[model samples]
Target: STGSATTTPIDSLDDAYITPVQIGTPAQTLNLDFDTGSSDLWVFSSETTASEVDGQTIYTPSKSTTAKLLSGATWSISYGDGSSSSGDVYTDTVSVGGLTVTGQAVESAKKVSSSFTEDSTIDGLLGLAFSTLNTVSPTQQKTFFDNAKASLDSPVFTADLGYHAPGTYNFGFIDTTAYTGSITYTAVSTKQGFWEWTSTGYAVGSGTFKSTSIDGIADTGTTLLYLPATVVSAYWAQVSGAKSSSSVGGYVFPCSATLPSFTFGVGSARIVIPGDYIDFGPISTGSSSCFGGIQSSAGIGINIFGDVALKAAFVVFNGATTPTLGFASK
Candidate 1:
């Protein structure tokens, strides 16, 4: 729907990430995550205590000659991942690229968790997924796209995840060159917030299996590949003594060897899980085994094909134009 000739530079932080951009002339900074599950521009503010704002990058407004805070109004948001942050509202003159939008809504966290605090590199998340799911409420609301869309040269928003490199997450235009063949378009059901497609079958290694179609919800926010219990067990079994060790969580095989390629066929679309994605280790000494990017969340709700799926293809969240998710070659 829209197009752009520019690529935005995002910096990766150790625990959390932050993008350093000039708010005004003096070069103020902020943290942003390209979130696909929601749409909004939120940041931690100076008012947040160091303890409360742990793992998050708190923006010091005083450091920015251009940034300003809004008084009287407060805000809070809890994510499905159980991570949450809250803070008072503020207004600022935010600039990205050649565009500068004034009176932008910003949040300052008063309370935060270690999950968010531990990451110094991964600051706040930038929800570029959908405008509909934005935590922006009726009482107090504003979306990053809602405000920046008008100023953008194009109406399209494109996200490119930089795994080995800096995967790009761009807004305002679709890079047609990044895609091959005709774009497959699917209609969205209003009831389910995430885009869902019934998977016809899956192939692990060279073996293809089919049964009742499984509903697949592609989510960028989620980091793993979750399958049905039967499918997970059967596939891992082929890994030569692969077993579910409660200590490791899901199925775990010897870490030294490479697993077979796992592919899921979604309608005509085929998604392949890279071998390396399955190599997860424990988060800590006492923690369960980390199954790379593949994990089991039985009875959670729906089968989620996370970033592993995205790594194989260029998954697009086409919110800048209409409600749709498009895929292509990066």
Candidate 2:
């Protein structure tokens, strides 16, 4: 069946996007983060400690007649940001945007890190990365997308992420009205279980685009753009009073500093990131110091084109043979 879904921002905290999903036979609705950087469909559930849970909603499998425990199956995951969760598994019907996948493996959280425990709005994470990255023990589990792909008209999805506004995540088909300009295609290398690709080059502001290949992953879950150390230093150098702050954990500058635009090359097309987006607001409440949304990916190995970068364009995550990525102006 052909399926498509629209996602909206949860309050003003536009760091991550969430979509409504129905799980189990009787259908319990839960909001989940659609993360392209990971692969697992996990949620807060009845198994979680009542004291540990804050404002987040929990799924109750016992309420669904079709929900079945997987016996010894379990899953645990740690994100790049150190946020983690672990839990047992349940097989249930998971539906998104009217598309249904029967017997989808749903990880129910038994434990969660402080990072997750504090974020009360995020009930769970729905990974859009390759199914190979799923953390289920013994036999790896297939993602909801993988299980629903065969029934989808096309094995493709589009992430139209926005800044402080609403966005849509379309599945099985691309909405031409959601984007403008020609969609430039790029071959993706998924050996790392991510939608990884190499850029032809990049430039600070309107400077000449350097022909340097930079490998990076398109991560919707991440909030900021992370580049190489040298690249980060060069960009920060252009900002007056900008310095690497130990207290802030990254580069910080005066809020009044004139920030420069950043651009990345995709084939012959270049997506320019606005200067305002680079300045990720004040470092703290009423603080004069502002944190740079673009930082060094030195220790992280691979660069990350996070929400700051991805929000500038409409991204197509093609799941067809030899998975490809398509980008265009929004």
Candidate 3:
């Protein structure tokens, strides 16, 4: 069986992509971030401190007859950005698109960081990364994707993240028409619980290709593409007014700067991130300087191929015993 659902960007900036999820007996609908970077299906709920709850939707376990609070189960997780959430665990009937999972562990948030509370676009997160990354104490829980994998004809799911438009996520089947040309599959390293892979090389605009193996993770939870400092500087060097600044943070350039497209290699495939995609958006409301979508991963430790890069291609997360990833131009 296969299930499909459209995930939409929170705004024109594509900060985060959220999917409508159904949870509980009466089916409480909440827009959840489909994050492939982490493995914890946590949500804002009635348990979340009232002071921490902002404009986001809350999942009330008490309201659902199907919801069952797990005795002594608790969880907490912190992201690379320092934002975090923690709470009690509940097993309930959870559904996404048309795929339903009985007795799915639903983490109800007792506390959330200010960043999460301020961002009302997303209510919680539906983690798709490996279950080993789950942070629940006592007993680790499986991710939504991991639990749904067995029922799927194949243990695979695809992400079609669009730029400024709504994109679709499919479970069990690949929509051949969603992409152009053929797909290039590569082995994924699940050692670290991320969808990690190696890029064969990179190129700035029409310049020469640099043949080098760069290891990174395909993270839907992150917003930008982060690479080695050398590669990031090479791309920014071409921009007239681009410079690394801590004021607005990271690399920034004139709003009208002539940005170049970034190309990365995967197996025999070469995916290009359009110049416009690299421009990102202005640093602030009426700021004349714009932030770049590409940044240095030196400080972040692991390089991240986030939504900026994912939106440029159709991606397949193959959850076989030995996982693999497929990339195709769209």
Candidate 4:
């Protein structure tokens, strides 16, 4: 079946800050994000001062039995959101759900933006959105998936997202209890560097993306959905009397009206995003209306589906076997 990814609301832990676990081991109780938009695995390092390391988790390589640092090279990454971080590159053991592997490339940021440093809630990001965007250079460095591909139970990793509060998203294997039958598969396109996709439309309840289509990318690295100006306006038009204002953010409409349900087509499969997902987090404008899920992103050419779109269905990426992503429901 076709459906969007799940979006989960997260806050920082006791502000204790987190560390990445070594691979080839059991679940390390580490906080990880299922980001499909970008491919990069980074953690904050102890060497990173409080001013440099913010809003993300830092992993201490010295603590891991299998940790290995790169040859004195410094690494850094800056997102479209204007937040950036810099640190050293290291390799260690790692795992996703029950899957485990060793010699996984990881980054420990030593310096980061203040706004990010204070976030304290997000430990680190697991960039599964696309392999081409993978920061780990295969010629010089290997990635978590690069090292763990051989050990995967089915040579496939699936993301099962829970919509209703604190839902579980599992990797490695698909849970049959969550879906009706074998998952429908769609071949991945190698044309786009990211996990770029083309969908027929979206649906909620019985309504679908009428005459509407999507040609954006899926990303776990991003926090919000970044849509094109035309797509955003067209989507809002369907809601009837939908309006846009900078003060109220991008898309805003009457709060009391019942929003239509829609779905996206992946080949012959149609993934459904329930109404609850649209209202994952309510956004209140100055007495205008309550806007939550839908926002605006007109100028940004790189539109992203983000976690909000990912949480609705089980997503699988198969970079190990071929440059492709397979979709199914758990």
Please give the TM-score that candidate 3 achieves against the real structure. Answer: 0.99
- Among all candidates shown, the one with the greatest TM-score: 3
Model 1 per-residue lDDT tens digits across residues 148-248? 77767665456555344445555576667775665565443434556565666787877765545777676665666787887787678767757777764
Candidate 3, residues 195-229, lDDT tens digits: the string is 99999999999999999999999999999999999
- Clashes in predicted model 1: 27
Off by over 4 Å in 3: none
Candidate 4 lDDT score at position 118 = 65
Best by lDDT: 3
What lDDT is obtained when candidate 2 is compared to the true structure? 0.89
Order the numbered candidates by TM-score, best leading: 3, 2, 1, 4
Lowest summed lDDT window (length 10), candidate 4: 11-20
Candidate that beats the other on TM-score, 2 or 3, i.e. the better one: 3
Score candidate 4 by lDDT.
0.57
Worst 10 residues of 3 by lDDT: 275-284
Backbone clashes under 3 angstroms, per model:
27, 0, 0, 40
**Candidate 1 lDDT score at position 242:** 70
What's the lDDT for all of these models?
Answer: 0.59, 0.89, 0.94, 0.57
Q: In terms of TM-score, which candidate is stronger, 1 or 2? A: 2
